[PDB]
Design a protein around this ligand. Sequence first.
Ligand SMILES: [Mg+2]
Ligand SMILES: [Mg+2]
Ligand SMILES: [Mg+2]
Ligand SMILES: [Mg+2]
Ligand SMILES: [Mg+2]
Ligand SMILES: [Mg+2]
Ligand SMILES: [Mg+2]
Ligand SMILES: [Mg+2]
Ligand SMILES: [Mg+2]
Ligand SMILES: [Mg+2]
Ligand SMILES: [Mg+2]
Ligand SMILES: [Mg+2]
Ligand SMILES: [Mg+2]
Ligand SMILES: [Mg+2]
Ligand SMILES: [Mg+2]
Ligand SMILES: [Mg+2]
Ligand SMILES: [Mg+2]
Ligand SMILES: [Mg+2]
Ligand SMILES: [Mg+2]
Ligand SMILES: [Mg+2]
Ligand SMILES: [Mg+2]
Ligand SMILES: [Mg+2]
Ligand SMILES: [Mg+2]
Ligand SMILES: [Mg+2]
Ligand SMILES: [Mg+2]
Ligand SMILES: [Mg+2]
Ligand SMILES: [Mg+2]
Ligand SMILES: [Mg+2]
Ligand SMILES: [Mg+2]
Ligand SMILES: [Mg+2]
Ligand SMILES: [Mg+2]
Ligand SMILES: [Mg+2]
Ligand SMILES: [Mg+2]
Ligand SMILES: [Mg+2]
Ligand SMILES: [Mg+2]
Ligand SMILES: [Mg+2]
Ligand SMILES: [Mg+2]
Ligand SMILES: [Mg+2]
Ligand SMILES: [Mg+2]
Ligand SMILES: [Mg+2]
Ligand SMILES: [Mg+2]
Ligand SMILES: [Mg+2]
Ligand SMILES: [Mg+2]
Ligand SMILES: [Mg+2]
Ligand SMILES: [Mg+2]
Ligand SMILES: [Mg+2]
Ligand SMILES: [Mg+2]
Ligand SMILES: [Mg+2]
Ligand SMILES: [Mg+2]
Ligand SMILES: [Mg+2]
Ligand SMILES: [Mg+2]
Ligand SMILES: [Mg+2]
Ligand SMILES: [Mg+2]
Ligand SMILES: [Mg+2]
Ligand SMILES: [Mg+2]
Ligand SMILES: [Mg+2]
Ligand SMILES: [Mg+2]
Ligand SMILES: [Mg+2]
Lengths: 90, 113, 54, 44
Amino acid sequence: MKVHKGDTVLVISGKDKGAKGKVLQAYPDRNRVLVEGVNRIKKHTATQEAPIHVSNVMVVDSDGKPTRIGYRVDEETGKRVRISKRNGKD
Amino acid sequence: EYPSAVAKARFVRVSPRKARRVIDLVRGRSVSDALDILRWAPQAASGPVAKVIASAAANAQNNGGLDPATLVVATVYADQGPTAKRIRPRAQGRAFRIRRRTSHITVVVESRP
Amino acid sequence: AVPKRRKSRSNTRSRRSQWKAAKTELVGVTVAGHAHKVPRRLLKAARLGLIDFD
Amino acid sequence: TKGKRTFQPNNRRRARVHGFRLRMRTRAGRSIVSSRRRKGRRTL
RNA sequence: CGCGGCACAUCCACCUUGUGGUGGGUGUGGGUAGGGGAGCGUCCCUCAUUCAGCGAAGCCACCGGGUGACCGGUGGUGGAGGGUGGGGGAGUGAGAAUGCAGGCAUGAGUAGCGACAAGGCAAGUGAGAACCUUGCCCGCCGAAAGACCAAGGGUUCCUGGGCCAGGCCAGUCCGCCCAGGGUGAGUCGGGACCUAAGGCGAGGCCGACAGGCGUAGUCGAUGGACAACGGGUUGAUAUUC
RNA sequence: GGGAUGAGCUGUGGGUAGGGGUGAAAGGCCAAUCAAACUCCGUGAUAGCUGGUUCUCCCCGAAAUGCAUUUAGGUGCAGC
RNA sequence: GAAAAGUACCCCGGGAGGGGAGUGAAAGAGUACCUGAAACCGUGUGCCUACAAUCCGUCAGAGCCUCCUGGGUGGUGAUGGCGUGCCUUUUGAAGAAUGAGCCUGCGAGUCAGGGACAUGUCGCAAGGUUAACCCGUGUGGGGUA
Ligand SMILES: [Mg+2]
Ligand SMILES: [Mg+2]
Ligand SMILES: [Mg+2]
Ligand SMILES: [Mg+2]
Ligand SMILES: [Mg+2]
Ligand SMILES: [Mg+2]
Ligand SMILES: [Mg+2]
Ligand SMILES: [Mg+2]
Ligand SMILES: [Mg+2]
Ligand SMILES: [Mg+2]
Ligand SMILES: [Mg+2]
Ligand SMILES: [Mg+2]
Ligand SMILES: [Mg+2]
Ligand SMILES: [Mg+2]
Ligand SMILES: [Mg+2]
Ligand SMILES: [Mg+2]
Ligand SMILES: [Mg+2]
Ligand SMILES: [Mg+2]
Ligand SMILES: [Mg+2]
Ligand SMILES: [Mg+2]
Ligand SMILES: [Mg+2]
Ligand SMILES: [Mg+2]
Ligand SMILES: [Mg+2]
Ligand SMILES: [Mg+2]
Ligand SMILES: [Mg+2]
Ligand SMILES: [Mg+2]
Ligand SMILES: [Mg+2]
Ligand SMILES: [Mg+2]
Ligand SMILES: [Mg+2]
Ligand SMILES: [Mg+2]
Ligand SMILES: [Mg+2]
Ligand SMILES: [Mg+2]
Ligand SMILES: [Mg+2]
Ligand SMILES: [Mg+2]
Ligand SMILES: [Mg+2]
Ligand SMILES: [Mg+2]
Ligand SMILES: [Mg+2]
Ligand SMILES: [Mg+2]
Ligand SMILES: [Mg+2]
Ligand SMILES: [Mg+2]
Ligand SMILES: [Mg+2]
Ligand SMILES: [Mg+2]
Ligand SMILES: [Mg+2]
Ligand SMILES: [Mg+2]
Ligand SMILES: [Mg+2]
Ligand SMILES: [Mg+2]
Ligand SMILES: [Mg+2]
Ligand SMILES: [Mg+2]
Ligand SMILES: [Mg+2]
Ligand SMILES: [Mg+2]
Ligand SMILES: [Mg+2]
Ligand SMILES: [Mg+2]
Ligand SMILES: [Mg+2]
Ligand SMILES: [Mg+2]
Ligand SMILES: [Mg+2]
Ligand SMILES: [Mg+2]
Ligand SMILES: [Mg+2]
Ligand SMILES: [Mg+2]
């Protein structure tokens, strides 16, 4: 999947527009991710966050603006590296 | 027009007609009087209905915070819930149908002088 | 013999409304300093405390 | 014969009259077993 | 007959005088089988157009409308698809078939609650007890209504829980529900021993094929042969420990 | 009430199968079915018979007769 | 239900179930759950109804009740007249002939073929048309047997 755990994502659709967040855990089978601070669900005691569909978040660039991402080849290992658009870094 | 509380006993395992037989003794009386008539009614349906009025009175006094003494069962009615279906074998290989009828008993008590 | 025809609503109800419960005569009693309401035939037992008042 | 019903169970006679080996001993029986496989019966 | 609305057929006069319209006559308009003609409603497709989360469909109510099938408006409910028009296509319309499926009435709170052994009291448990527990009285069977085996059933056995289904009532109980546990053999009953009826049957004989029958043989107990008794013990096994 | 040492009853195991079996014979019985079992298939058998066949309106509107018929409650042709 | 956010906690209740809170856009979505029709079952309420013989309606019609401006809606209907269910099938049925307890859903002239006849319509016309087949992403173009 293109949204992994460690990376920070921005919510692009849902109640929490513009919510910067970092993925706690991804569920590629259900195409969801758990993001910090996103859709704060007030659970009855005996408040946590519920997973959000991966279509509703875009990976942040680590250079500010959100982005779609693609891949290139590093030429060293042959691995396909996740890279951004808007100058295609990291 | 009067402050009221509702209680519902849903899927109670008594026929609606028998429930009605026992609630027609207490329709329109004060809660305490109705509880006494149901205490002393030999019909078995008096038990469930009695605790329905008791629950309605308790809701009135606890959630509504109003006086139990001024409390009258304003509208009580039993309608039919789902009926389970059973087979009772009869003579010569016939199979007849038994119906386990259940009731939803609704009570609205209101407080009034 | 079997019913020739189904009863109408009116006829069914006219018969069925007569299936009602006999009303019990209730009188007030005061045992142990507290008021209660009991059938009249059970007054003796109520005063002897033989009636579980619930 | 008063009171005695038609099915008197006896597992050995059930097996010797309707059993798998009895079926497999004739072409009609094998046809029946293959027909029940084809229909998908759990019991063959 | 009068006055008003509609329709069909036909006739006469104007308008592109037959695709036919308009006006006016005249006649006609009960109807089963049946013929002919013209339409309503549902769904799907295409084209165009237009509504729809500021709320489609469906459903409900009310107010209106048309000559009919039916239609529209408004509101409620609801939550994602509709409307109109030119065409195209139908699993296109139900009240009847002792029609089919499901739901629900009527009979009716009626019959019945399954042997003619028979229950009772006290105490207990429990929210709840005629039915469960304990004790004691009373009664019934006792060539069974007792104790066992085989067949059959399959965990129903025991313990601990449970109590909205089941038990012809209720249920705290249960052969019900749940979980765990429980069945110990040299000698018992079978096999590893034997054969009967009968079955199958190498080869074989017969038969267009399919196959039939059958020899050797091999199965097949209900029979033959074959070595254990008494006592104790568990909640549940015991000629098994 | 009949038999109840017998042409007895009964268990276990087996055999006979559908124009076939078996029958101390009743057309009895052959899985609650038997003057030819049951199941599946031919198969959506066939039925001159019974029943049913669903929205609307407009116009017209019968026949129940003749002839023939293995025909007479069917059908052909005529008539309408 | 978009997401279990599947109702914490409190109260009645042995439980079941419910009430209040809470979640949710919505609980007029509460694991008996989308929409939620009809039959069928209540409860409340307006009118009528215990001297009347009723295919249950229809026309006439008082009076009440309701909602709007004496008048008009909507509900009811004292009272008067008229009035023999529906279907099938029959010479003829309200028929004491058949079928139907009720509701909802389903359930019957369809399709094929260069078939046959007749018609409406369209193309071409002393001609008309292809069949198989061939070539095309198609519904198009060839194809004379
Ligand atoms: Mg998305
Ligand atoms: Mg029986
Ligand atoms: Mg006419
Ligand atoms: Mg006329
Ligand atoms: Mg006609
Ligand atoms: Mg909205
Ligand atoms: Mg709305
Ligand atoms: Mg639709
Ligand atoms: Mg309408
Ligand atoms: Mg609307
Ligand atoms: Mg709507
Ligand atoms: Mg529509
Ligand atoms: Mg269209
Ligand atoms: Mg069309
Ligand atoms: Mg149809
Ligand atoms: Mg219908
Ligand atoms: Mg029907
Ligand atoms: Mg039915
Ligand atoms: Mg009776
Ligand atoms: Mg009785
Ligand atoms: Mg009994
Ligand atoms: Mg006691
Ligand atoms: Mg005795
Ligand atoms: Mg003796
Ligand atoms: Mg036990
Ligand atoms: Mg137990
Ligand atoms: Mg119980
Ligand atoms: Mg019970
Ligand atoms: Mg051989
Ligand atoms: Mg042989
Ligand atoms: Mg042999
Ligand atoms: Mg042997
Ligand atoms: Mg033996
Ligand atoms: Mg034992
Ligand atoms: Mg004797
Ligand atoms: Mg004698
Ligand atoms: Mg004798
Ligand atoms: Mg004879
Ligand atoms: Mg027989
Ligand atoms: Mg024959
Ligand atoms: Mg054939
Ligand atoms: Mg005419
Ligand atoms: Mg003719
Ligand atoms: Mg609540
Ligand atoms: Mg609430
Ligand atoms: Mg909220
Ligand atoms: Mg909603
Ligand atoms: Mg439901
Ligand atoms: Mg619903
Ligand atoms: Mg009077
Ligand atoms: Mg008269
Ligand atoms: Mg009248
Ligand atoms: Mg006729
Ligand atoms: Mg006649
Ligand atoms: Mg009749
Ligand atoms: Mg009659
Ligand atoms: Mg007849
Ligand atoms: Mg009938």
